[PDB]
Design a protein around this nucleic acid. Sequence first.
DNA 1: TTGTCGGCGAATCGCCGACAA
DNA 2: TTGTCGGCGAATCGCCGACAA
Lengths: 293, 293
Amino acid sequence: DAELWYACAGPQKALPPVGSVVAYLPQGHIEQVASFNNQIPRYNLPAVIPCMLNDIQLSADPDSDEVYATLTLCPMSKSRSFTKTLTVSDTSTHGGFSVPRRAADDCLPKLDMSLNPPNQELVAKDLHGNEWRFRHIFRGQPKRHLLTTGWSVFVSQKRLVAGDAVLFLRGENGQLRVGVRRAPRPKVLTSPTMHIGVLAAAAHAATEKSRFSLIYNPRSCPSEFVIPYSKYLKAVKSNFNVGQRFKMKHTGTITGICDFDPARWPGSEWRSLQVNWDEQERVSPWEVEPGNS
Amino acid sequence: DAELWYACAGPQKALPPVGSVVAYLPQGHIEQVASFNNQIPRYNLPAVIPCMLNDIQLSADPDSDEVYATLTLCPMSKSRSFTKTLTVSDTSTHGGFSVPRRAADDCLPKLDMSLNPPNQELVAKDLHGNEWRFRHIFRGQPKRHLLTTGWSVFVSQKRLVAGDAVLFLRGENGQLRVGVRRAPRPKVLTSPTMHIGVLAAAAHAATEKSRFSLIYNPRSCPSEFVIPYSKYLKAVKSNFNVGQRFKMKHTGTITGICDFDPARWPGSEWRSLQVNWDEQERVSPWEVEPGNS
DNA sequence: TTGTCGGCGAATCGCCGACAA
DNA sequence: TTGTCGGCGAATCGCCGACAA
Ligand SMILES: [Cl-]
Ligand SMILES: [Cl-]
């Protein structure tokens, strides 16, 4: 289910539609793969590459549960939801799970309060179609919504620890969906060979106008690097200036406008906005909005 | 400890020494990275690349325990040991671990048989220096060597299942070492971008005579692709012929001698020997020996 | 509102010879 | 030689209100 995939990725995540023109930004692709590790031949590669979004394949690791997507590019010429950060008691083998009162009313199905105690056995599917059975009971003094039977098994099988978060989604159907967003945490190739591979594949696809492929790792990608081409153009046509107040979907002030990496990426709009927050320091024009909406 | 690293990799594994000339075989490097997944721009890349072995870095995944090495190449112009495949009872929460009688005598320290029952608390370090305490008891009827206290914890923490194997090494020192060899089982880059990255990095290093780097995954590499250059030359000078009997460090018969992939790797000695076993079908001259020693 | 706790009953865990392959 | 089993004692597991933040 695609709604579950975006929930585990992040609330502000929504990939461009297949068949639409997108702006491929290689600086951001490298930033993603460089976050997995810690010079190279210089390629004549443009800082932006308009591409047709040929295909998207949402995927999830079975054992680890991390979500990722495979995108195919070709260079050119809603539902009720809630998330809770798991506490120590939630993950402890001692007790069960404390359901936020707002979540049980706005997300979980309504219990029969005429029962004593009100209870139901919920059944939720994860990203791989596996069913999970939870007993949802309303007890305690003061009274509360708890998940008892089936919760600790869910904790051990998915190896959940405190600080992690559990997700629940209820669509129009009675079926429930459950997800996991783990707290922040080179096996096949070294980083320079990964770095070189990204450039050469993009270069070959750019000069030949042939389609290539990449992996999107949402929870390991600081800034999206496949954005709608229209959103990219409207950002370029925008004329930011020093001292302007901006906002992010947190507020700050633009302190400068210059290139982020003028050595190998001259004239690039990537992270070209020097900013200072009010309470990371280099952002792109398309991820900010003038701070007076 | 380097002895533990090679134990977890495999008995027939021993990398060339640092500072020696090695034969880099890109066909085998691709075979390794293609085993992690399931067309590309053609590169003028030779089937063998003599390189100086600049550095080796043995490493091990902390959580998963898989071993890998980072090698740095530059193109040019002993101890008592035993291994047991873990049974169901070994991994079951029910009992402990059955130590093979030959292992306790030839590897583990000698128990004081004057005790009743003979026992000692062993302390072994894993690949990351963590200590593991096991009670080694000699009991049962018929009598046997068992590991009781500390074994089931070792099973749960390392997530061991039946079919996996445990290793133990005893050097000249009293300190013991323990290892794990798990049964046979794309996150950051797609396979074509991995494929392209291997070629381009090797190509750039070959034409510029600059040093590059790669990852060796022993338990995911079917045939070694960084071998001593002398061993490669002596294989080329060898004149195999059809019908010759060969042996592998299993015996068979050579049925043909031709190129393995004449499309993109013409005139390559890689897997250039068609063989038929007596009881996989394409091997290289340097991994076989005439079957009459 | 909700995280943590103690309390017991339920249950898995773990060490021990008893047995065949 | 050694894998699996039953047997109990040891122990963690799990559901329940009681309590403050
Ligand atoms: Cl899916
Ligand atoms: Cl080491």
